[PDB]
Amino acid sequence: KYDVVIIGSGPAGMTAAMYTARSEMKTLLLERGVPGGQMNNTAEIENYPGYETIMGPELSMKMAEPLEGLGVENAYGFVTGIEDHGDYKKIITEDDEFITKSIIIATGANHRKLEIPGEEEYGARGVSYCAVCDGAFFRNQEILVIGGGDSAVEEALYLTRFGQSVTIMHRRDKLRAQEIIQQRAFKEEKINFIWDSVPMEIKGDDKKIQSVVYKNVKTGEVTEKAFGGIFIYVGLDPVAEFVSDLGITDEAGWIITDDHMRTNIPGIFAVGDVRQKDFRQITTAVGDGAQAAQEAYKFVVEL
Amino acid sequence: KYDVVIIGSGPAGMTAAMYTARSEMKTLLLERGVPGGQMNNTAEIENYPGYETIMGPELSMKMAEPLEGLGVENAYGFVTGIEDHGDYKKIITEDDEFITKSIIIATGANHRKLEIPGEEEYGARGVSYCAVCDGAFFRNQEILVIGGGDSAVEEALYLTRFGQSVTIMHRRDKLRAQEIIQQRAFKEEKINFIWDSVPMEIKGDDKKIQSVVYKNVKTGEVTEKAFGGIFIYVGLDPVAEFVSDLGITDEAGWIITDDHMRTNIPGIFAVGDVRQKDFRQITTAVGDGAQAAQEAYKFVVEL
Ligand SMILES: Cc1cc2nc3c(=O)[nH]c(=O)nc-3n(C[C@H](O)[C@H](O)[C@H](O)COP(=O)(O)OP(=O)(O)OC[C@H]3O[C@@H](n4cnc5c(N)ncnc54)[C@H](O)[C@@H]3O)c2cc1C
Ligand SMILES: Cc1cc2nc3c(=O)[nH]c(=O)nc-3n(C[C@H](O)[C@H](O)[C@H](O)COP(=O)(O)OP(=O)(O)OC[C@H]3O[C@@H](n4cnc5c(N)ncnc54)[C@H](O)[C@@H]3O)c2cc1C
Ligand SMILES: NC(=O)c1ccc[n+]([C@@H]2O[C@H](COP(=O)([O-])OP(=O)(O)OC[C@H]3O[C@@H](n4cnc5c(N)ncnc54)[C@H](OP(=O)(O)O)[C@@H]3O)[C@@H](O)[C@H]2O)c1
Ligand SMILES: NC(=O)c1ccc[n+]([C@@H]2O[C@H](COP(=O)([O-])OP(=O)(O)OC[C@H]3O[C@@H](n4cnc5c(N)ncnc54)[C@H](OP(=O)(O)O)[C@@H]3O)[C@@H](O)[C@H]2O)c1
């Protein structure tokens, strides 16, 4: 009944959907939230070819805008499962089922947790995984950012608009982030570093975070220091719960594809951050999206 | 001496260069012409995620703009050859040589010729491979467009601004172009079709084209019809002459990479339209560009 259903309306799904619709495939784009995916949780995007800088939520709106006119059917849906019925597939959401010849899974990734004490307890009250979402609640605080990658370092630089200071705690003595971003953080007077360290406990009073205990990974030295907020950027986990059963994921839960975005299962493709891969960017999300869309057309043409 | 040299400043090279520069790699971007590559020969781009429509040359300027500020060294160069010296490589242009640890080849593709009589003879005087370049010279003419793909059908639709009529001659009875573009051409009153046909001869007077002879591929029927211009869109050939010797191309001349944009030769990558692949789009150019850029960084880090 659908030629293709695309699950998730971040940049990978939005690209796939634009391409399927332009092939005049009967296209459903399901999204549980706001179109844009992780881009809506991004302050400034500097490395999307075509824009010198752009706010994440504006890029999300720009990518979503043409879809309706192209004939993509945009619908609300949280997908809970997928069933392969050979020559068609069924997609189950909270309330609905959809039948389709092909599926492109574009559900992205989610913040990894530290799995330390206080992390759950201070959820709404000093612990955050989204700087653009939460930053302004921390005006004039001493903010802590955990991690050493692109997100941690970029989001620390963003947070310097709000905090008195921002400290980046990284578990080694060399960041992973792109060098241009490292150098910006090195130079920024309001960014401090706690190198070779990991957080052990987040502590607070009845109602908000007050301090963080941490440990040096070369010496075991343990320090407790006062902070007003903690933003955690320690990597990603796959958002692929609805395919756990299907035999298309690796040991960590990422969806395995070949170079044409195909899974094991004919007519089920995956694109973007949800895939097993190393390089998670908007550029490669878009690329993947386009490739899967062409592969889905071909698959359905053959069917 | 360079960490990376990127050869060609279309969207694949421009993306690669942006990414290498952001990794603080000493980056040279050589281009023989104008930044933008095939995008400068494109009228309206509707399917680049982030823009609902944009003129090709404007998208080219937008993609080129940040490069200087990021520290990419933009230089004129026509590359004539590359020599692999194990732990470095040499790149030869008309007048220069450049030594580099890594290379990303992003030189794209060029219009395939019909290799028919009159095609060379009427080069500047009715025969064209670029509608945005030449279209306005054909105001009020009966224009012919040869081919059945995305370029032929899109460029025919563009040319209807100028010609009295535009006729698309395709060698089968079904176009290859994206269905949205086919349907637009079907509906457009100024587009005619010559199905199941190929051009055999382009004829003219001393000074300009006047007519085209063609043949039906199912019946052999031969017809001669008057036209004022002919635009040819019969596919692509690789732009890879400078690596013919190196063992990295297929029988047609396309550069063979794996999924991480690597050729045979360590530290030589290829991206975008020049690669052996099926799906040549700006989206996948950009994706390839980004992937190669991350692979080059890693390669050079290791070296
Ligand atoms: C803070 C931060 C800054 C970043 N900055 C940049 C940058 O500057 N440049 C860059 O290139 N990359 C950047 N990235 C990476 C970039 O945002 C991602 O690579 C890209 O968004 C991934 O796109 P995607 O479409 O694969 O996944 P996503 O954007 O993750 O979208 C997945 C979508 O699927 C939906 N979804 C999930 N599960 C379901 C379900 N079960 N049913 C329905 N819908 C579901 C989600 O709601 C989401 O909208 C950044 C990431 C972060 C966190
Ligand atoms: C008429 C037309 C319309 C199109 N419309 C669209 C569209 O709407 N959407 C879309 O997604 N795709 C479209 N495309 C496809 C898109 O333009 C290409 O996929 C994309 O430009 C390829 O980028 P690239 O960087 O790999 O190659 P290119 O853009 O081909 O750039 C290659 C560059 O390398 C340079 N170069 C070549 N040889 C050398 C040398 N020896 N030394 C130095 N420099 C050299 C060239 O000057 C060029 O600037 C269109 C193509 C055409 C022809
Ligand atoms: N501008 C952009 O292009 C952009 C922006 C944001 C994100 N992204 C991409 O999105 C993906 C996710 O990036 P990310 O930064 O979110 O994740 P990431 O690359 O996995 O980096 C996580 C960082 O946190 C460190 N870390 C992990 N556990 C830690 C702990 N317990 N204590 C302290 N530090 C810890 C990691 O250490 P190690 O380095 O030791 O592993 C790593 O440096 C990446 O591929 C990234 O490039 C891109
Ligand atoms: N909007 C966009 O995304 C966009 C726009 C332009 C181009 N592109 C991409 O750029 C690449 C190049 O596209 P293209 O259209 O330039 O090339 P293409 O896809 O190779 O199509 C060439 C067309 O001409 C036909 N043909 C070949 N020889 C012919 C002859 N002698 N007489 C009449 N017709 C003939 C082919 O026939 P058969 O079909 O029988 O082979 C084909 O339909 C493609 O991957 C394309 O999708 C994309």
DSSP-assigned letters across all residues of A150-187: HHHHHHHHHHTTTSSEEEEE-SSSS--S-HHHHHHHHH
CA B68, CA A105: separation in Å to the nearest integer?
A: 37
Domain extent for A161: 112-235
Q: Which residues contact B301 (CB under 8 A, 6 or more apart)?
A: none
Domain limit, last residue, from B235, B264, B281: B235
Q: Are A158 and A131 in contact (CB under 8 A)?
A: yes
Domain limit, last residue, from B192, B208, B235: B235
B141 shares a domain with B152: yes
Is the CB of residue A57 less than 8 Å away from at least one CB of chain B? no
- Give the closest residue to A230 by CA, choosing from A257, A210, A260, A247: A210
CB of B272 shorter than 6 A to ligand 2: yes
- Catalytic residue list of A: 130, 133-134
CA A47, CA A149: separation in Å to the nearest integer?
A: 16
A215 shares a domain with A167: yes
Nearest ligand, CA A96 = 1
CA B146, CA B140: separation in Å to the nearest integer?
A: 19
Least Cα separation, residue A125 to chain B (angstroms):
35
Beta-bridged to residue A124, according to DSSP, are none
B70 shares a domain with B3: yes
CB pairs under 8 A between A and B: 102
φ, ψ for residue A222 (rounded to 5)? -110, 130
Q: Is A272 left (phi over 0), alpha (psi -120 to 50) or beta?
A: left
Domain limit, last residue, from B214, B235, B256: B235
CB contact under 8 A, A179 and B11: no
The technique is: X-ray
| Side-chain-facing half-sphere of A212: CA atoms under 13 Å | 27
For B221, counting Cβ atoms within 10 Å of its Cβ (0-12 exposed, 13-18 middle, 19+ buried), the class is exposed
Report the sign of the C-alpha dihedral through residues B149, B155, B157, B160, in that order: negative
When scoring B19, B44, B286 by the number of chain A Cβ atoms within 10 A, the one with the most, hence best to mutate, is: B286
B246 shares a domain with B226: no
Q: Which residues contact B213 (CB under 8 A, 6 or more apart)?
A: B199, B200, B201, B203, B222, B223, B224
Chain A residues inside the 8 Å CB shell of B281: 290
Residue type at position A273: D
For A71, counting Cβ atoms within 10 Å of its Cβ (0-12 exposed, 13-18 middle, 19+ buried), the class is middle
Residue type at position A26: K
Which CA distances in Å does A293 have to A20, A269, B212, B287? 5, 9, 38, 15
Q: Smallest Cβ distance to A24: which of B65, B66, B179? A: B179
Report the sign of the C-alpha dihedral through residues B20, B23, B25, B28, in that order: positive
Q: Smallest Cβ distance to B50: which of A21, A23, A59? A: A59
Q: Which residues contact B98 (CB under 8 A, 6 or more apart)?
A: B1, B2, B5, B28, B30, B90, B91
CATH number of the CATH domain containing A273: 3.50.50.60
Chain B residues inside the 8 Å CB shell of A184: none
| Closest residue in B to A260 (Cα–Cα) | B259
Three-state helix/strand/coil letters over chain B: CECEEEECCCHHHHHHHHHHHHCCCCEEEEECCCCCHHHHHCCEECCCCCCCCEEHHHHHHHHHCCCCCCCCEEEECCEEEEEEECCEEEEEECCCEEEECCEEECCCEEECCCCCCCCCCCCCCCEECCHHHHHHHHCCCEEEEECCCHHHHHHHHHHCCCCCEEEEECCCCCCCCCHHHHHHHHHCCCEEEECCEEEEEEEECCCCEEEEEEEECCCCCEEEEECCEEEECCCEEECCHHHHHHCCECCCCCECCCCCCECCCCCEEECHHHECCCCCCHHHHHHHHHHHHHHHHHHHHHC
- Catalytic residue list of B: 130, 133-134
CB contact under 8 A, B51 and A49: no
Q: Are A273 and A257 in contact (CB under 8 A)?
A: no
Is the CB of residue B231 less than 8 Å away from at least one CB of chain A? no
Q: What is the 8-class DSSP label of residue A58?
A: H
Per the structure, the count of domains in chain A is 2
A102 shares a domain with A9: yes
A215 shares a domain with A71: no
B241 shares a domain with B107: yes
Place of tokens 């390089």: A279
Entry resolution (Å): 1.8
CA A147, CA A125: separation in Å to the nearest integer?
A: 20
CB of B42 shorter than 6 A to ligand 2: yes
